[PDB]
Design a protein around this ligand. Structure first.
Ligand SMILES: Nc1ncnc2c1ncn2[C@@H]1O[C@H](COP(=O)(O)OP(=O)(O)OP(=O)(O)O)[C@@H](O)[C@H]1O
Ligand SMILES: Nc1ncnc2c1ncn2[C@@H]1O[C@H](COP(=O)(O)OP(=O)(O)OP(=O)(O)O)[C@@H](O)[C@H]1O
Ligand SMILES: [Mg+2]
Ligand SMILES: [Mg+2]
Lengths: 428, 442
């Protein structure tokens, strides 16, 4: 709300006027008469906003934007033509101010210009702490080309892949590459929605106001994450929406018509579910339009090293942990795993390794011993816990001595018959 | 974009003009002449944007009165006002009242095209942020004290020094301070010194001659120096000039750069030890340490583990779409008793692991302790095996007595030294337990 503003203009009267009003609001104002003084001001310290006069012009706008892609530029246009002013918006400008201007318009113009730039930065920052698609494999290239092909179409998509494979990312990639890219990207995850609230989540409630997924998705893309998690009750509801593109809100007569591009996804066999009568035959066909298949990590094992490299880089910009070198034995083992949970499971494992080895020297390699086993005393009171301990301890000792009860008893500090009786009492 | 836009004016020439220009641009435009007809359109379907006339003669509610109702129902729905012939003081009050912008009659067709684009672009950005995304979870006095500290020091202009072990939430406390600070709207630029090689440190912070250094980015905002203890001697002196002169020279620069930054520093290491050893500057440390904030280790706030596990599970659910499971009493007891060298980062990674590992199992099925990794389970009391060399080397009575010590200490940890709670769970009376502990000498 108190930014550093650079006001570039040929006329000192305007340079003073714009810089004055803004500085009086609480901004840090710096001024330039030409491109050479302007670029040198950016060189002193980069501003958080630029006010650029069109006629000194659009060449300076390009240089500011080439050197600083995230720096908002607002134009200073004459009363006569918004033609060049509007041309500048397309050339990269955010907005424009027309002479003569009221001080209050200028305040708002700068405020709105900064707010956007801040949001775009709040996006890049939030994105760097959270999780395009990595992979050089033939599987990945084929998927990227499928995305590139199906995204410009207006067709309904059916994304199929194992859990943690990349289905939601493919959905978002298709969205970013479609004509609805500026429109909403609304997600519906059946697994995390309660059945008692499933109707409200999809359709909303009548008149603070609760807007359902479908209404929210209007003019954009609605993502049905794991359709198989929807009960038969709500599968019918989805289908009834698919026929007419209309629905009613919960506790309301009003019927709403929306225009949504549906993207579905499943890690389940839907045809087999139709055979079991657990999923609707008509619904499946209505949703299963343009199929897109996300491959298992098992189907692109060659990417495991480049994905570990990528996740390792990602967690460094998140936790400040210096990326480590994974040993060849750990890597060999990682590459061999079935990855039931695929890329979500790979990332979690890579992270676990970063945490455990954090204290260590960067020169030391991540060894296979660190990988988890896939790659009760604490809940019990004292007497019970003591009893389980004793039982397990003796079982372990007998096995250690290969069943020689007499050798066990002597080592343990017991007499033969006493060990037999103890074992019986413990339930062995 | 193809947005659903609602056009509300009492003048038919205007409604039709706004609706016309924007529909020819690709939008879906709907018109309303009064508050009742406008609220009728919102009920039909919520638009992506509203163009609302300031005045509205002939309705139940003025333009500013309807602005309030649209915002009440849909708080995130942008509204652009329509005002005419420089009577804009009214329009700025509307902005102050919740409207994104105003367009004033008479207007150019391209001005209206640009006003709508911008209103929609901001709306979308605001939406994108909410979709990706803040609070410090804990019910413990330690946490309440920390939240009170953040609350007290966030308004001040003072430099913060946050100390705490790895993954305890020092960065979060920095973000939390920034969010409650007078620079909440300014940038929050982080420098992860442990991730930067000493040679490149000055380039990362100050930048180079014609490449923008972190300080230049953090101007008008806050610079978060993550692991200051990794600043080389040369950088230390430069940071020192930043704190006192509010200036710095770029790498290979003869030229001074002025900056207005509020530094929040952090360390997981012993800086006092480094000063004693000649690797860190004494005066720089005291200047950086004006207001110290000590983030407590997770083992020093084991009261918060159950809450944090629930929290982390909810957060994985919103991320992956996995239904939040119920943690077994065994797993929770193990998770609660643990020292957590990697603190809340390590706890989170572990909660995420159980979620991944139990995806697609029966939903009633409790998450069990045996699913947890060796660094968690093997450091705590459990049934022995032939492989446990330390236990196997001991005879029964000796193995049993060590277990009692191991078990009781673990339960004490779990119940954060609360011997009254510990006794209740293990099956003893509190004085019987104090006598047992003193006897074992644990
Ligand atoms: N090609 C890829 N490159 C990099 N990261 C990827 C790639 N594919 C997936 N990921 C990441 O791996 C994780 C997998 O989640 P994703 O969005 O793909 O959901 P999904 O495949 O539908 O499965 P589920 O949501 O059921 O776990 C995410 O963190 C995602 O960002
Ligand atoms: N009190 C808290 N309640 C809930 N979540 C928290 C809390 N403190 C931290 N977190 C979470 O735990 C993790 C700790 O991250 P954070 O960066 O804040 O810690 P740190 O002390 O800076 O250490 P490092 O960044 O080196 O791992 C993050 O995932 C964060 O969301
Ligand atoms: Mg001019
Ligand atoms: Mg009117």
């Amino acid at each position: 709300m108190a930014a550093d503003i650079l006001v570039v203009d040929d006329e000192v009267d305007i340079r003073d006027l714009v810089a004055g009003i803004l500085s009086d609001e609480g901004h840090e104002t710096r001024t330039a008469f030409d491109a050479d003084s302007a670029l040198a001001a950016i060189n002193d310290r980069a501003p958080r906003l630029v006010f650029l006069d069109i006629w000194l012009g659009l060449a300076l706008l390009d240089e500011i934007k080439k050197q600083h892609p995230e720096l908002p530029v607002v134009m200073i246009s004459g009363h006569g033509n918004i033609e060049t002013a509007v041309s500048a918006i397309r050339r990269g400008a955010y907005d424009f101010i027309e002479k003569p201007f009221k001080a209050d318009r200028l305040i708002l113009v700068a405020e709105r210009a900064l707010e956007t730039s801040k949001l775009k930065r709040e996006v890049s920052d939030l994105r760097k702490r959270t999780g395009e698609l990595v992979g050089t494999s033939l599987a990945m290239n084929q998927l990227r080309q499928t995305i590139e092909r199906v995204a410009p179409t207006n067709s309904r998509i059916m994304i199929t892949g194992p859990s943690g494979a990349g289905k939601e990312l493919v959905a978002r990639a298709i969205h970013a590459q479609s004509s609805r890219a500026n429109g909403p990207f609304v997600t519906v995850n059946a697994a995390t929605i309660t059945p008692e609230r499933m109707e409200i989540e999809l359709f909303g409630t009548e008149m603070e106001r609760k807007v359902g997924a479908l209404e929210e998705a209007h003019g954009g893309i609605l993502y049905l994450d794991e359709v198989a998690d929807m009960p038969r009750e709500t599968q019918n509801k989805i289908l009834r929406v698919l026929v007419d593109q209309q629905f009613e809100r919960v506790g309301g007569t009003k019927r709403v018509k929306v225009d949504v591009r549906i993207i579905s996804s499943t890690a389940q066999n839907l045809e087999g579910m139709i055979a079991e009568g657990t999923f609707r035959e008509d619904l499946f066909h209505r949703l299963s339009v343009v199929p897109v298949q996300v491959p298992a990590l098992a189907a692109r094992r060659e990417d495991i090293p480049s994905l570990v490299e990528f996740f390792m880089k990602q967690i460094a910009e998140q936790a400040g942990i210096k990326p480590r070198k994974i040993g060849p034995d750990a890597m060999a083992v990682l590459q061999a795993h079935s990855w039931p949970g695929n890329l979500r499971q790979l990332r979690n494992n890579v992270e676990r390794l970063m945490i455990l080895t954090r204290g260590d020297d960067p020169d030391e390699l991540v060894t296979a011993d660190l990988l988890p086993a896939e790659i009760h005393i604490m809940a019990l009171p004292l007497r019970e816990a003591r009893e389980r301990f004793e039982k397990e301890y003796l079982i372990a000792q007998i096995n250690r001595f290969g069943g020689n009860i007499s050798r066990t008893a002597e080592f343990v500090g017991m007499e033969r018959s006493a060990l037999h009786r103890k074992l019986k009492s413990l339930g062995v």
